Design a protein around this ligand. Structure first.
Ligand SMILES: CC(=O)N[C@@H]1[C@@H](O[C@@H]2O[C@@H](C)[C@@H](O)[C@@H](O)[C@@H]2O)[C@H](O[C@@H]2O[C@H](CO)[C@H](O)[C@H](O)[C@H]2O[C@@H]2O[C@@H](C)[C@@H](O)[C@@H](O)[C@@H]2O)[C@@H](CO)O[C@H]1O
Ligand SMILES: [Ca+2]
Length: 136
């Protein structure tokens, strides 16, 4: 029941495989079954990454990242979540080793940012996200 400022914002990612376009992580659908059409998928890049562009700077609090759930859930491990300002200067970064459940929640404590990037640190692994939600 809070405004998800990432919903329907422009997205990009390192590449696309299996028609897993990056907008699937901001489609309002948390379903993690890749066959549902809700989940992104890159090729096995060096490294794989995904990003949302808020279009303007905003003050970011909670970021909630929902994993793929039907298969290959371990791929979302050893990754950074990085905030960038309007000139793509790095303003904050958190590292996530792995998920114990279907999602992870990170609190960036009001940091001003335009872009939120999720980046695997292990190359040669596709990045698949069910949904990334971003709150003020
Ligand atoms: C259109 C089509 O047939 N799609 C296939 C993928 O198969 C479908 O998606 C899977 C996730 C399963 O639900 C499957 O039952 C369904 O048909 C196929 O994925 C692989 O499917 C095999 C079974 O045939 C295994 O389940 C394997 O784990 C699946 O691969 C994982 O999911 C993929 C989407 C990629 O992320 C892979 O890297 C994973 O290992 C793929 C790959 O053969 O091919 C599509 O064309
Ligand atoms: Ca989705």
């Amino acid at each position: 029941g809070n405004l998800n400022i990432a919903y329907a914002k422009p997205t990009t990612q390192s590449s696309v495989d299996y028609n897993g376009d990056p907008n699937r992580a901001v489609d309002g659908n948390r379903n993690g079954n890749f066959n549902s059409g809700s989940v992104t998928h890159t090729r096995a890049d060096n490294p794989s990454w995904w990003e949302v562009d808020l279009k303007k700077m905003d003050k970011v609090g909670l970021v909630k990242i929902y994993n793929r759930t039907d298969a290959e859930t371990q791929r979302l491990s050893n990754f950074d979540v990085i905030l960038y300002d309007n000139n793509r200067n790095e303003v904050a970064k958190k590292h996530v080793n792995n998920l114990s459940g279907e999602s992870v929640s990170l609190d960036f404590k009001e940091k001003g940012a335009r872009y939120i990037k999720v980046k695997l640190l292990t190359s040669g692994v596709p990045l698949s996200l069910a949904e990334v939600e971003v709150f003020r």
